[PDB]
Amino acid sequence: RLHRRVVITGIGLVTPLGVGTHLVWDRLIGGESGIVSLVGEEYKSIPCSVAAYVPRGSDEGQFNEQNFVSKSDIKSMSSPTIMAIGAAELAMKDSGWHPQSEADQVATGVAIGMGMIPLEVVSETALNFQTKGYNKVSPFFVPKILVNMAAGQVSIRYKLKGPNHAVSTACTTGAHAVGDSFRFIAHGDADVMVAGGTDSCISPLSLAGFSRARALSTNSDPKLACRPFHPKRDGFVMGEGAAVLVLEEYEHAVQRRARIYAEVLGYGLSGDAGHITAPDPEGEGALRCMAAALKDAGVQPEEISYINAHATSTPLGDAAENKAIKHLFKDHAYALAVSSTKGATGHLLGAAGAVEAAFTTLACYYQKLPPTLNLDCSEPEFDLNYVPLKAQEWKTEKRFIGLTNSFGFGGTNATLCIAGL
Amino acid sequence: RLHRRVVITGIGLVTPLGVGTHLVWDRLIGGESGIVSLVGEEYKSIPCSVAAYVPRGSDEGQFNEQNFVSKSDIKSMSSPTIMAIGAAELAMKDSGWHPQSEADQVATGVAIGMGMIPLEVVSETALNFQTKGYNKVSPFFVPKILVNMAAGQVSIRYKLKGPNHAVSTACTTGAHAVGDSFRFIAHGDADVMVAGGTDSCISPLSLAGFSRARALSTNSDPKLACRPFHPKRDGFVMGEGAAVLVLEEYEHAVQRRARIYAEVLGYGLSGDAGHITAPDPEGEGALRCMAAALKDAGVQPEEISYINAHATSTPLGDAAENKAIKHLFKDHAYALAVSSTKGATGHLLGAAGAVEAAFTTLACYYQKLPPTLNLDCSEPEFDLNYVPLKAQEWKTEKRFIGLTNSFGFGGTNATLCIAGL
Amino acid sequence: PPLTLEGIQDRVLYVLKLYDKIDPEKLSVNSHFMKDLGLDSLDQVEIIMAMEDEFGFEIPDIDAEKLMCPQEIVDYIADKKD
Numbered sequence: 001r002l003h004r005r006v007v008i009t010g011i012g013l014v015t016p017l018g019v020g021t022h023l024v025w026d027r028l029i030g031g032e033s034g035i036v037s038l039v040g041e042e043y044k045s046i047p048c049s050v051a052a053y054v055p056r057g058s059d060e061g062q063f064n065e066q067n068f069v070s071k072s073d074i075k076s077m078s079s080p081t082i083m084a085i086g087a088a089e090l091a092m093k094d095s096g097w098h099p100q101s102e103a104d105q106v107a108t109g110v111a112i113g114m115g116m117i118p119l120e121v122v123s124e125t126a127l128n129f130q131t132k133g134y135n136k137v138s139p140f141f142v143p144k145i146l147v148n149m150a151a152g153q154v155s156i157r158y159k160l161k162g163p164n165h166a167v168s169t170a171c172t173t174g175a176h177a178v179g180d181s182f183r184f185i186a187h188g189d190a191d192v193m194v195a196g197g198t199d200s201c202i203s204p205l206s207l208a209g210f211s212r213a214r215a216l217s218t219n220s221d222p223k224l225a226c227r228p229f230h231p232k233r234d235g236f237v238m239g240e241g242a243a244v245l246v247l248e249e250y251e252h253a254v255q256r257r258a259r260i261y262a263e264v265l266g267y268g269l270s271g272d273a274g275h276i277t278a279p280d281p282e283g284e285g286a287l288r289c290m291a292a293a294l295k296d297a298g299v300q301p302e303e304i305s306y307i308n309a310h311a312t313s314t315p316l317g318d319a320a321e322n323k324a325i326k327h328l329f330k331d332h333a334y335a336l337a338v339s340s341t342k343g344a345t346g347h348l349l350g351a352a353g354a355v356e357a358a359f360t361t362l363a364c365y366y367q368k369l370p371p372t373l374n375l376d377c378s379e380p381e382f383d384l385n386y387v388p389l390k391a392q393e394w395k396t397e398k399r400f401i402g403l404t405n406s407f408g409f410g411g412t413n414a415t416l417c418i419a420g421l
Numbered sequence: 422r423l424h425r426r427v428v429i430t431g432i433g434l435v436t437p438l439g440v441g442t443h444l445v446w447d448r449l450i451g452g453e454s455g456i457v458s459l460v461g462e463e464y465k466s467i468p469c470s471v472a473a474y475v476p477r478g479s480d481e482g483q484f485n486e487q488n489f490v491s492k493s494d495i496k497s498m499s500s501p502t503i504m505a506i507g508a509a510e511l512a513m514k515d516s517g518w519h520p521q522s523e524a525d526q527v528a529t530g531v532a533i534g535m536g537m538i539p540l541e542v543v544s545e546t547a548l549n550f551q552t553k554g555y556n557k558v559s560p561f562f563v564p565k566i567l568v569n570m571a572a573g574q575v576s577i578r579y580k581l582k583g584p585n586h587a588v589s590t591a592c593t594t595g596a597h598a599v600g601d602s603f604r605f606i607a608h609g610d611a612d613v614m615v616a617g618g619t620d621s622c623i624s625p626l627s628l629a630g631f632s633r634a635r636a637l638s639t640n641s642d643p644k645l646a647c648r649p650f651h652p653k654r655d656g657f658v659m660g661e662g663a664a665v666l667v668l669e670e671y672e673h674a675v676q677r678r679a680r681i682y683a684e685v686l687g688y689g690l691s692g693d694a695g696h697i698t699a700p701d702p703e704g705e706g707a708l709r710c711m712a713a714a715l716k717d718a719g720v721q722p723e724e725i726s727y728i729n730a731h732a733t734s735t736p737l738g739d740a741a742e743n744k745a746i747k748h749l750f751k752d753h754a755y756a757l758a759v760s761s762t763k764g765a766t767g768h769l770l771g772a773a774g775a776v777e778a779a780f781t782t783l784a785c786y787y788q789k790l791p792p793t794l795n796l797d798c799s800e801p802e803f804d805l806n807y808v809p810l811k812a813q814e815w816k817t818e819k820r821f822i823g824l825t826n827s828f829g830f831g832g833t834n835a836t837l838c839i840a841g842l
Numbered sequence: 843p844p845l846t847l848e849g850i851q852d853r854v855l856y857v858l859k860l861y862d863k864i865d866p867e868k869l870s871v872n873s874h875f876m877k878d879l880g881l882d883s884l885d886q887v888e889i890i891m892a893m894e895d896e897f898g899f900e901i902p903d904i905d906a907e908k909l910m911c912p913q914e915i916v917d918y919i920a921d922k923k924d
């Protein structure tokens with residue numbers, strides 16, 4: 001009917017690498033990581049000893065809550081909410097879109113989700129209730145647990161009256177936010193979508209839960225703990241962060257004289273259906289969502305040159321994705337490059353797919369491929385180019401097209417197809 | 422040719438009214454309600470004294486975990502997960518879609534979401550951990566609190582390998598589930614989607630938090646507590662339950678010779694942007710949402726005959742939705758019927774949109790409009806036909822089109838346009 | 843003598859002036875929290891909790907719903923006295 005192209009005009013990053021689009025990118029290409037050792041008595045007795053935290057402060061690349069939100073706000077709202085607000089402020093500023101018009105406002109929606117409720121706030125309110133009773137319980141408790149509070153807050157501040165779609169899917173949230181936003185724009189429900197994910201669930205209880213699930217890396221050393229594709233990978237490293245992306249219809253962007261990073265071509269979604277804990281050993285579900293994304297994009301596998309892998313430094317997971325890439329791309333798999341950025345940021349949970357979407361986008365804009373960290377050596381099953389250790393220039397005779405993969409609990413798979421102009 | 426028709430071929434319901442499609446419908450049209458008085462020692466501190474529970478029993482229309490799930494499964498899974506699997510079972514059975522073919526499995530996706538995590542589980546595990554240490558924490562902890570776990574179990578159990586989309590949007594979850602499923606089928610991503618919502622957050626902690634926010638009814642009388650559009654409405658009544666709907670491409674259902682309840686025409690989504698706490702008193706967002714859904718449908722306001730209101734016996738909310746209906750439909754507002762089913766079921770939170778979608782679908786199949794309960798008395802501001810007290814037949818010769826609305830915290834609005842064939 | 847009303851009024855004001863969301867110059871005894879101070883329901887619940895600590899008595903939610911102004915709060919506090 002009407003074919004609307006969708007592009008990215010704005011990036012907002014609040015990450016374990018720091019804050020700001022240039023800064024976080026420069027650091028990621030440089031081979032930096034945010035993974036650090038846990039400190040304090042609370043954490044003792046917990047099998048994981050490492051996590052990845054957004055640096056807080058006034059210094060450049062440090063997240064300062066006070067710049068983004070008011071004193072009253074800080075007390076009222078959860079840490080994931082505040083990060084999303086900040087990421088969103090930065091993205092809109094990056095976009096230079098500030099809708100003043102009613103027409104512009106109705107044209108602009110939000111799609112920002114949160115993977116997990118912060119367990120600490122539950123526990124603190126629950127104890128307060130038992131100890132001190134109902135009168136004591138704060139009214140803001142329920143808003144603190146709600147997923148869409150982030151989206152609501154951004155919506156009010158930037159006056160965004162278009163489609164609102166907060167989505168929590170745990171590990172895949174950010175991927176669904178971008179993909180669903182793309183679909184909405186492409187359908188004509190909006191000209192502009194503010195999209196992303198946030199997570200800030202690093203806590204004794206949360207880490208306990210994940211450790212007991214056998215998800216987490218047991219390694220004491222923050223430098224080595226997260227090692228995607230590596231032989232010694234023992235589990236993922238929990239991270240915290242938000243990423244926000246402004247998606248826009250192409251002509252809308254072009255005409256307002258916006259800076260365009262990249263074009264969203266394709267979204268794909270699939271289910272494994274084998275098992276809740278365990279990835280499909282052959283990666284048949286990952287294959288299917290990648291291929292669904294390509295079909296959406298109108299692109300053949302041979303056209304893809306980079307993949308931002310969802311590898312999270314787990315034995316079964318990293319293997320599955322690798323099989324699927326090999327089967328999908330056949331001989332061209334040895335032509336492409338695959339990297340996992342999880343060594344730098346940790347697993348950002350809800351935010352993971354948004355930040356990796358932002359990274360894939362930037363890869364397209366700069367023709368530069370972020371490293372897989374800690375990949376010193378590689379087993380024969382892992383024979384592809386994983387951009388080990390050092391960043392690589394992205395070279396191809398055709399157009400720059402990449403995939404970013406987000407796989408989640410229960411066998412939910414998501415893939416985005418992002419291209420250079 | 423790129424856009425296809427989408428129809429609903431199956432419903433399954435686990436509600437405070439009971440379980441099963443015929444049963445829940447007959448009881449709804451009959452004017453039965455699940456709302457009851459809370460019966461606990463732990464409830465005494467809190468002002469709310471009422472709630473709606475799914476009936477548990479071997480007797481007909483009473484939920485029995487065993488028929489749906491194994492005893493071992495029972496211990497591992499949370500209550501909302503269990504209700505969703507049962508609802509999903511019943512829905513697929515009602516649809517008669519049981520894909521075995523590889524083609525059929527890939528063609529069939531899941532969109533089932535849980536609006537709120539059950540706070541009690543978190544509180545239990547947290548306290549356990551602090552008193553008795555790390556070793557105490559269950560491995561099964563984290564999986565119970567993940568939102569997509571319900572969806573993953575369905576996917577594995579019924580072999581659904583297509584698009585997986587678990588959405589937690591708090592109150593609009595079920596609405597997003599059906600809408601997004603429709604878009605995905607229409608887009609060509611899936612021939613069939615199993616879509617719906619679940620919530621079971623009835624507990625001291627949840628009611629405490631809701632009451633602190635002043636959302637809940639303080640009325641002690643269970644029969645009168647939930648009274649949409651009534652003058653003395655004092656807040657919503659919490660419900661629990663799950664609803665699942667099988668949506669399917671028109672030609673696909675026709676070929677399998679399936680019984681088709683209704684056609685999904687349109688999906689609409691908007692944001693208020695005015696405030697987090699309160700709905701826009703003008704209903705600007707609700708109107709824009711409704712209008713979005715009609716535009717998606719390619720239907721004019723005059724063609725609408727029924728609206729399932731998202732009214733939750735809230736003073737500001739019921740007023741706002743009313744205002745939106747009146748502004749959108751103008752003089753046709755007096756020719757249509759509006760009803761809220763929340764007096765029967767309570768507010769099912771994440772499941773609300775899906776159960777309401779099911780009720781709207783059934784309303785189209787028959788031409789029969791469920792009552793708004795407790796509407797003994799009506800103010801001049803509420804001058805519409807709200808199908809007070811008793812059900813009304815609506816057998817127009819012209820095509821039966823309804824809207825069902827879902828409004829959520831932070832000003833998220835969702836609307837579905839559903840039509841009889 | 844238990845209490846003086848003007849004194850309970852200074853206390854109510856003192857609590858209100860401590861709440862961050864209220865703006866001091868705008869604060870007046872007859873100022874309505876939602877209508878003029880721009881506060882929301884949730885903000886008012888916090889105000890009553892502050893009043894609860896200050897005067898050392900629990901206020902039931904029903905009565906708290908009613909108190910939409912400082913002067914109104916004062917009158918409810920005074921109810922214990924003449």
Ligand SMILES: *[C@@H](CCCCCC)C(=O)NCCNC(=O)CCNC(=O)[C@H](O)C(C)(C)COP(*)(=O)O
Pocket residue numbers: 142143591592631634635636698699700733735737738739770828829830831882883884
């Ligand atoms: C689902 C339930 C979450 C409730 C948490 C806090 C409201 C949901 O999204 N509900 C909100 C949809 N809104 C309505 O239909 C209700 C309208 N009124 C309200 O939102 C609340 O009752 C307040 C306005 C917060 C009442 O507080 P103040 O005492 O005005």
